[PDB]
Design a protein around this ligand. Structure first.
Ligand code: NA
Length: 164
């Protein structure tokens, strides 16, 4: 896969009692889930090589906009974010057998992944609110593109174990 020097790539790795959910993020300056790319759902004991490869694929699709390009304005539009978010919730409930968003989110942990010049910053979080996650302290897993997909998968699972 093609990763460019100086370019930022972002992705997310969420997990609850039914699934792992890997998602491409996009943006400019700050990044967020990019619902242009559907979530990739995986079983909880997916092997490290599949988990690493899936997150690398998600990162490769991460878009960086030119500020105020039609793509940037659309991506950061308040109402479009809301509509795409609600569609994501409804679709994930359908794909995982949930009838309430309360149940979908109850045990959902979240890890963020940032790639830049070969460095992978894999960050755990605290599930602070029903549908939101905030950083915790000094718990990142730092890897790089030197690492095999399997080593990346191990570091992803490690970061998930650090979520609270
Ligand atoms: Na995500």
């Amino acid at each position: 896969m093609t990763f460019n020097q100086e370019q930022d790539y972002w992705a997310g790795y969420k997990a609850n009692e039914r699934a792992l959910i890997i998602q491409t993020w996009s943006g400019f300056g700050r990044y967020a889930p990019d619902h242009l790319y559907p979530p990739h759902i995986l079983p909880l004991d997916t092997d490290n090589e599949t988990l690493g490869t899936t997150v690398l694929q998600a990162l490769a699709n991460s878009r960086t906009f030119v500020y105020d390009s039609p793509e940037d304005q659309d991506f950061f539009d308040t109402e479009k974010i809301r509509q795409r978010y609600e569609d994501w919730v409804a679709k994930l409930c359908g794909n995982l057998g949930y009838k309430t968003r309360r149940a979908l989110f109850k045990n959902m942990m979240s890890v963020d992944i940032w790639l830049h010049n070969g460095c992978l910053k894999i960050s755990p979080s605290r599930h602070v609110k029903l549908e939101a996650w905030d950083a915790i302290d000094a718990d990142d897993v730092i890897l790089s593109l030197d690492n095999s997909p399997e080593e990346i998968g191990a570091g992803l699972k490690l970061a998930l174990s650090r979520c609270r």
